[PDB]
Curated annotation (Swiss-Prot), chain A:
Histone H5 performs the same function as H1, being necessary for the condensation of nucleosome chains into higher order structures, and replaces histone H1 in certain cells. One of its GO terms (cellular component) is nucleosome. Its main location: nucleus. Belongs to the histone H1/H5 family. The chain holds residues 1 to 128 of 190 of the full protein. Residues 1-29 are annotated as: Disordered. Erythroid cells. This is Histone H5. The modification Phosphoserine is found at residues 23, 30. Residues 13-24 have a biased composition (Basic residues).
Length: 128, 73
């Protein structure tokens, strides 16, 4: 209990004074990657060095980035909190429990739309 | 008099439900009281929509203790 909550995370006071009012509330220990992954624009998910960049603002590094980042990743997998995506070459994947997409899928690809045919098509009903 | 896209009403329902077990059938029914189909056929039209959406695989159901239903997107 000492090295888990009192002695070893004492640096929280020498380093983490960022929990305060007037907004600008830096997330507590249990919810760092949550904000980073909700504010995401990727398809595979967040990565390790990517997480380092998003949480690099005013968050104490210590031995946390060495042990406890992946320790908490495994803890949340055990608790059924976050999921990921398997692959090679994406250089990382991470996702919390978000209910916005299909839980299973046989495998497909998405699409994007560029407005190029609508102006030419607007005249067709007027034409005939 | 408007006709909302009938496929996405369920999606919005569990998106806005914010419940542990999942959306119940009464929950979806009470959620959809906007200007829409009167619902005389609800018990079968909703059934067919869940059947089609689960054939796709975008819904879930689990058993437990709580409300009459536990439908989850």
């Amino acid at each position: 209990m000492t090295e888990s909550l009192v002695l070893s995370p004492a640096p929280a006071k020498p380093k983490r004074v960022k929990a305060s009012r007037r907004s600008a509330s830096h997330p507590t220990y249990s919810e760092m990657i949550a904000a980073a992954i909700r504010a995401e624009k990727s398809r595979g998910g967040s990565s390790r060095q990517s997480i380092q960049k998003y949480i690099k603002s005013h968050y104490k590094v210590g031995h946390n980035a060495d042990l406890q980042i992946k320790l908490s990743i495994r803890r949340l997998l055990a608790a059924g909190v976050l999921k990921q995506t398997k692959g090679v070459g994406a250089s990382g994947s991470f996702r919390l429990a978000k209910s916005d997409k299909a839980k299973r899928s046989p495998g497909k690809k998405k699409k994007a739309v560029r407005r190029s045919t609508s102006p030419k098509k607007a005249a067709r009903p007027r034409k005939a």
